[PDB]
Design a protein around this ligand. Structure first.
Ligand code: UA3
Length: 124
């Protein structure tokens, strides 16, 4: 198994590096986190901040989620993140990604007790 919260950490947390250096970050990280084993996950964002900092977003700016649900939250401060987007030549199982580093406000969906992140919605 795997809790929804655990999956969020596996799919979106990377407190080890301050920023994605070198264009090969995503190719390695996406495979490393098992995001390309069943297929190539199209888009995925990694957050380069402490777990406490990201978890704290669940008590920050309440905003509507893209699917219409009301349990999304936007970080007050910008955060260091890395977007991974699959390229065109990308063909399973050899998934290929474009690595994009940036500093933006993240938006995550939270749920449960404790109230923690379970989905990365967007960055703005
Ligand atoms: O900026 C973006 C946009 C999308 N996704 C990712 O694409 C996913 C698939 O619907 C979702 O993963 P998740 O729901 O397991 O977090 C997330 O919205 C990101 O990780 N970052």
């Amino acid at each position: 198994k795997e809790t929804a919260a655990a999956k969020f950490e596996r799919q979106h947390m990377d407190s080890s590096t301050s920023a994605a250096s070198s264009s090969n970050y995503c190719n390695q990280m996406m495979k490393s986190r098992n995001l390309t084993k069943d297929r190539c996950k199209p888009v995925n964002t990694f957050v380069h901040e402490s777990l406490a900092d990201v978890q704290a977003v669940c008590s920050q700016k309440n905003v509507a989620c893209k699917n219409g649900q009301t349990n999304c939250y936007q970080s007050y401060s910008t955060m260091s993140i890395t977007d991974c987007r699959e390229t065109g030549s990308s063909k399973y199982p050899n998934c290929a990604y474009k690595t994009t580093q940036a500093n933006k406000h993240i938006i995550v969906a939270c749920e449960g007790n404790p109230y923690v992140p379970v989905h990365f919605d967007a960055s703005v």
